[PDB]
Enzyme design. Structure first.
Site, PDB file in Angstrom:
ATOM      1  N   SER A  87     108.070  40.558 116.359  1.00  0.00           N
ATOM      2  CA  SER A  87     107.291  39.293 116.444  1.00  0.00           C
ATOM      3  C   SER A  87     105.833  39.629 116.737  1.00  0.00           C
ATOM      4  O   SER A  87     104.925  39.048 116.128  1.00  0.00           O
ATOM      5  CB  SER A  87     107.857  38.381 117.485  1.00  0.00           C
ATOM      6  N   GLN A 110     106.842  46.797 121.262  1.00  0.00           N
ATOM      7  CA  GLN A 110     107.842  47.331 122.232  1.00  0.00           C
ATOM      8  C   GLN A 110     107.770  48.861 122.267  1.00  0.00           C
ATOM      9  O   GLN A 110     107.997  49.433 123.331  1.00  0.00           O
ATOM     10  CB  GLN A 110     109.254  46.852 121.891  1.00  0.00           C
ATOM     11  N   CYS A 138     112.112  37.289 116.892  1.00  0.00           N
ATOM     12  CA  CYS A 138     113.090  38.369 116.570  1.00  0.00           C
ATOM     13  C   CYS A 138     114.255  38.168 117.555  1.00  0.00           C
ATOM     14  O   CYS A 138     114.645  36.985 117.774  1.00  0.00           O
ATOM     15  CB  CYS A 138     112.377  39.717 116.559  1.00  0.00           C
TER      16      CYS A 138
END
Length: 281
Positions: free
Chosen positions: A221, A261, A214
């Site tokens: 990802s 994330q 990404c």
């Protein structure tokens, strides 16, 4: 079973808390090569570095560094290279890595521009008759064909080693519809994309590891690899509900920091696996 765990975390809105326990439990290994001053312009983000133990080394005697990690999932018999979106100055390195690792597929989960900023160099040709030469790494790349669909594009590329005149076909899988903010509402189109990559043979052990990126190569990802590996373990195991997403994430985080994330991306990963399990059971 994860479905009951999902409802529990969801109904209690504990996603930020689950995510924080994963953050605190996550491995930390040295990343000395990434932090060398001569490598400063090979990194897109100063806080996203490959660990020394799992980093991909370029076969060039001068500087072997690229921001890329090998994630080896032993039980699932799956490898992945997670990398950052290439920079203007690392497009040649990116294709050298694809060449040296014998990868058959590149999975791209970002647009070149998101939120009005460049997330990634334009590292592949836009037209058949306009090929790209990477002088620094002696590679030529040609667009052979492009198949544009609603949610993703597949491109056939030919990579030629100008030093040896060997050529290989590379498949470029570009998921084009991940929203600028948050995560898709439904995992349906992401799962369709994942089954298309699988059907290509790009994730198969007769090839080098797939390259997944990404912008940073950790968030979107991460979701790609986590869903693929979890679904594969549910096929392989006597008890499919023995598969703990959180444990699989922590094993993957030994190989590259920061995979998944946000708590939103964690929730989406659960949803993708839970839904994908229906097409697999």
């Amino acid at each position: 079973e994860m479905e009951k765990e999902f409802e529990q975390i969801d109904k209690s809105g504990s996603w930020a808390a689950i995510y924080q326990d994963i953050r605190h439990e996550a491995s930390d290994f040295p990343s000395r090569v990434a932090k060398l001053p001569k490598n400063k312009n090979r990194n897109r983000y100063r806080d996203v570095s490959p660990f020394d133990h799992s980093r991909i080394k370029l076969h060039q005697e001068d500087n072997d560094y690229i921001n890329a990690s090998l994630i080896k999932m032993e039980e699932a018999q799956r490898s992945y290279i997670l990398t950052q979106g290439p920079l203007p100055n690392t497009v040649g390195h990116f294709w050298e890595m694809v060449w040296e690792q014998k990868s058959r597929g590149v999975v791209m989960l970002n647009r070149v521009m998101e939120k009005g900023s460049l997330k990634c160099a334009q590292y592949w040709p836009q037209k058949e008759e306009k090929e790209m030469i990477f002088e620094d790494t002696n590679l030529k790349l040609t667009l052979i064909s492009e198949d544009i669909k609603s949610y993703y594009t597949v491109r056939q590329l030919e990579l030629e080693n100008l030093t040896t005149q060997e050529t290989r076909e590379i498949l470029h899988f570009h998921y084009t519809t991940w929203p600028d903010f948050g995560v898709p509402e439904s995992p349906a189109s992401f799962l369709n994309f994942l089954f298309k990559v699988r059907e290509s043979g790009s994730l198969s052990p007769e090839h080098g590891p797939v390259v997944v990126h990404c912008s940073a190569g950790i968030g979107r990802s991460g979701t790609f690899c986590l869903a693929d590996t979890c679904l594969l373990l549910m096929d392989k195991r006597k008890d499919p509900s023995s598969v703990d997403i959180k444990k699989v994430l922590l094993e993957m985080r030994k190989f590259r920091m920061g995979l998944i994330q946000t708590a939103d991306q964690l929730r989406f990963s659960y949803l993708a696996v839970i839904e994908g399990a229906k097409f697999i059971m």
